[model samples]
Target: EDSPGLKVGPVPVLVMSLLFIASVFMLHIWGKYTRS
Candidate 1:
């Protein structure tokens, strides 16, 4: 049988990374606008 860790794998990690990057980008944009 395949490992459980292998089953729930790279897709989630990639999605989470993308989400984190989007969040940071949004926060940066918000901060920039607010500072102006």
Candidate 2:
């Protein structure tokens, strides 16, 4: 699926980045708590 047409930015980019960062932080905290 390598087709490039016209990918919209702004909101889509924001949502993905925010979601990624949120997941990373949640995992970090969870790991720390479980290890200790």
Best by lDDT: 1
Task: Give me the runs in candidate 2 sitting further than 4 Å from their true place.
Answer: 1-9, 29-36
Report clash pairs, candidate 1: none
Per-residue lDDT over 1-36 for candidate 2, one digit per residue giving the tens place of the 0 to 100 score? 537565664478678888887775445665563322
Q: Model 1 over residues 1-33: C-alpha lDDT tens digits?
A: 865757664688678778887765445665563
Which candidate ranks first by TM-score, i.e. highest?
Answer: 1
Superposed by TM-score, candidate 2 places the C-alpha of residue 6 at a distance from the truth, in angstroms, of 4.2
Q: Which portions of model 1 show Cα errors greater than 4 Å?
A: 1-3, 7-10, 29-36
Q: What's the C-alpha lDDT at position 5 in model 2?
A: 60
TM-score of each: 0.40, 0.38
